[PDB]
Amino acid sequence: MRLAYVKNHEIYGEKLLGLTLRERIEKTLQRAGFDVRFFDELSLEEAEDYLIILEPVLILERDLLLEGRKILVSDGFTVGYFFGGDFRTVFDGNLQSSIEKYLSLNNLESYEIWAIKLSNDNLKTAEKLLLSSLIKAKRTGLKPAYYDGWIAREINRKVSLRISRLLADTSVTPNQITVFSFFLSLVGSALFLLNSYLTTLLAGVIIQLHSIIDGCDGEIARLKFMESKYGAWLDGVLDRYSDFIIVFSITYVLSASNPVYWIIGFLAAFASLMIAYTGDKFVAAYMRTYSPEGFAIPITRDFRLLIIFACSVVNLPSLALVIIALLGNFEALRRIVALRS
Amino acid sequence: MRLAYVKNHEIYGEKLLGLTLRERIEKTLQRAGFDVRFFDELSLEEAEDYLIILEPVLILERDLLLEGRKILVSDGFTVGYFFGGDFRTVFDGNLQSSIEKYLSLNNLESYEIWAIKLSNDNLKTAEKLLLSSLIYDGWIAREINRKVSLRISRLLADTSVTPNQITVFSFFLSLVGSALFLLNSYLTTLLAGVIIQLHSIIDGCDGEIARLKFMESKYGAWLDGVLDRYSDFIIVFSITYVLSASNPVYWIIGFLAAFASLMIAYTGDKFVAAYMRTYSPEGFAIPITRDFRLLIIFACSVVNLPSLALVIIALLGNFEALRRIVALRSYTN
Ligand SMILES: Nc1ccn([C@@H]2O[C@H](COP(=O)(O)OP(=O)(O)O)[C@@H](O)[C@H]2O)c(=O)n1
Ligand SMILES: Nc1ccn([C@@H]2O[C@H](COP(=O)(O)OP(=O)(O)O)[C@@H](O)[C@H]2O)c(=O)n1
Ligand SMILES: [Ca+2]
Ligand SMILES: [Ca+2]
Ligand SMILES: [Ca+2]
Ligand SMILES: [Ca+2]
């Protein structure tokens, strides 16, 4: 057992995006493999190692790892103390005194973690920072199946986080958002079938809306510690259905004009699925996140749906199929070659 | 460090399916996290734990785990001894005496492992058992296809052929089958179906040879799956393209059949990605895994109805995908 001692503060009682700051630090530390102990005066229990947090803080880091005794720091400011089990041999019943003693007996290195020390004034700042930590990127500490693409990170996340902020105060669950996001893709697909510029235009808009909202399910999940294995599975599986159904609807309509589009449609659908499959198969076989180091063709899902959007507003959904089919299939082949090395 | 002491025997020099029995026991124990030491007379080195194998044996178990002192047994027969580090406090330079001493000081529980004690006559028996140990397979794969592939892998074992080469070669066969479909004649459709089934069988050999010769790799596992997605797509696309000339409606059935094939694979691999365990339904599941899909294509092709295969794959495949979505709601998260 590992113990995390967190000094009580009146500000921990304030709610930030659905959860009190008290449960947030509690769950983050629990995730990190610590049994949590809130205290006013500290009585020491036996454990392998000790984490001590004296000042009120919001931890933003997601995959916190503490190996070896060190001082945890946020931008030069001490966030907490991580001592070894031998701290028991120094503790004298006074926390202030004991920390001074233990620190003098050692030379602890500083260790940077993403966190914000909390004040009565900077809670608006903490909200924005907490939201920004919800994105699938390396800076946050998350270890997903894949990281957000450029379109996702700089465009879609900007909108979805604003939506998730409003959803945080509700009882809406990630799975519900996932299903709703999937349903939106069907609305977009149905609009394509009506075969008119207006409905084609509306479809593209809704497909992009779907692309954005499909980020909210993951955001709320990470934001409220409601992540789940099934949720992760469902989120992905339905995205394959969406990609397939969207391309089918566009292909079916275009086939009325020229049957050749069946082939381009077939190739576009396959590409979309294989970009997903190559990445998820990598995770399955390597048991680590898929992430290209250098050159990669920007044809990840965030790009594919933006392309469908952009092409749809100019009434050329066929061009999106061509682009996805070409860029997508070459990217799939590229991954095969790149992984050989 | 954990040390595995294996007493030398003349039989370890014999070759079984491409590798000497000496190399096989060495590699198997290394996989299990042991440093191996072959010996005539035993001199003891310091280590966390000790594994002692006195009689010549071929280990068939794949995921051997040794936690806590035990005697390793195969059908009542002692295969080896697994002693704690405290064996150092008893060893007196004589192996027989030291083992006798340590065994009398303890009360070792027995622990069953899959293995066969080796002799000069039962090597044919060891070959069959080793081959059988190479095979989440569907019923068709396990009871039909494996029967043929193991016989092929047996011949491949004596060669320098790698798993990746078999995977790519298998992928090539699927293209030949697809090309034959495009020629639009019963004969070529019949030949196509046969090659698709041959492809299905040989697609088991890459995994067999990999496990048989300890040549498993992450990229190999990745490639094995990815190219099978390519094969499934190209086969269905090829059948659909020809059939579309008669009735364009088959484009829709083809799209649904291709999608189904890909999603049966994706749902399974995505499960592994999210749950980090093998996908395996406890009870009922619609038999439309790859071994079934390709047999259906084969069976329908010999009677010149490849269109029926698309319908069947499209129907059973999509319902199975949907079934998995609903079934997984149960015990997960
Ligand atoms: N219903 C859901 C949806 C996502 N998640 C989690 O969030 C991750 C996906 O985040 P995301 O939705 O922002 O990713 P994208 O689909 O936008 O690319 C999944 O892998 C899950 O870990 C969940 O737990 N339950
Ligand atoms: N070129 C290859 C092919 C398979 N393998 C391994 O063998 C497994 C596949 O076994 P298999 O080919 O007998 O059965 P299938 O999964 O292909 O139906 C892969 O998951 C790999 O662990 C490999 O390492 N390299
Ligand atoms: Ca999502
Ligand atoms: Ca989704
Ligand atoms: Ca294979
Ligand atoms: Ca394969």
Write the secondary structure of B263-330 as one string of H (helix), E (strand) and C (coil): HHHHHHHHHHHHHCCCCCCCCCCCCCCHHHHHHHHHHHHHCCCHHHHHHHHHHHHHHHHHHHHHHCCC
Count of Cβ atoms closer than 10 Å to residue B151 Cβ: 12
**Positions of chain breaks in chain B, given as the residue before each break (C to N > 2.5 Å):** 135
Q: How far is CA B98 from CA A30, B89, B104, in A?
A: 48, 10, 10
Give yes or no for A266 touching B (CB within 8 A).
yes
SS3 A57: strand
Q: For ligand 2, atom 11, which residue shows the shortest CA distance?
A: B207
Give yes or no for B248 touching A (CB within 8 A).
yes
Q: DSSP per residue over A217-230, as a string?
A: HHHHHHHTT---HH
Q: In this structure, are residues B114 and B60 in contact, taking their beta carbons and an 8 Å threshold?
A: yes
Min Cα–Cα distance to chain B from A236, Å = 8
Residues of A in contact with B274 (CB under 8 A): 145, 229-230, 232-233, 236
Residue B158's identity, in one-letter code, is D
Q: For ligand 2, atom 6, which residue shows the shortest CA distance?
A: B207
Measured in degrees and rounded to the nearest 5, phi and psi for residue A284 equal -70, -35
Among the listed residues B257, B262, B318, the one whose alpha carbon sits nearest the alpha carbon of residue B286: B318
Among the listed residues B71, B77, B80, B65, the one whose alpha carbon sits nearest the alpha carbon of residue B111: B71
CB contact under 8 A, B332 and A286: no
A218/B177 Cα distance (integer angstroms)? 42
For residue B212, the CA-to-ligand 2 centroid distance in Å is 11
Residues of B in contact with A283 (CB under 8 A): 273
SS3 A290: strand
Residues of B in contact with A273 (CB under 8 A): 229, 259, 262, 266
Binding-site residues of A, in ranges, read 136, 146, 157, 174-175, 178, 214, 217-218, 222, 228, 235, 239
Give yes or no for B279 touching A (CB within 8 A).
no
Go through the domains of chain B in sequence order and give each one's CATH number.
1-136 (3.90.550.30), 137-333 (1.20.120.1760)
Give yes or no for A339 touching B (CB within 8 A).
yes
Q: Write down the experimental method used for this entry.
A: X-ray
Which residues make Cβ contacts (< 8 Å) with residue A24, sequence separation at least 6?
A16, A58, A59
Q: For ligand 2, atom 13, which residue shows the shortest CA distance?
A: B207
Q: For ligand 1, atom 1, which residue shows the shortest CA distance?
A: A175
CB under 8 Å, gap of 24 or more: what pairs does A191-196 form?
A192/A246, A192/A249, A192/A250, A192/A253, A192/A317, A193/A249, A193/A252, A193/A253, A195/A253, A195/A256
Q: How many residues does chain A have?
A: 341
Q: Determine the atom of ligand 1 nearest the C-alpha atom of A234.
A: 1
The label of the residue with tokens 């008290």 reads A22
The label of the residue with tokens 């059948």 reads B239
Q: Ligand 3 is a single-atom ion; what residues have CB below 5 A from it?
A: A 214, 217-218, 235
Phi-psi region of A10 (alpha: psi -120 to 50; beta: other; left: phi over 0): alpha
Min Cα–Cα distance to chain A from B195, Å = 23
B265/A310 Cα distance (integer angstroms)? 31
Q: Ligand 4 is a single-atom ion; what residues have CB below 5 A from it?
A: A 214, 235, 238-239
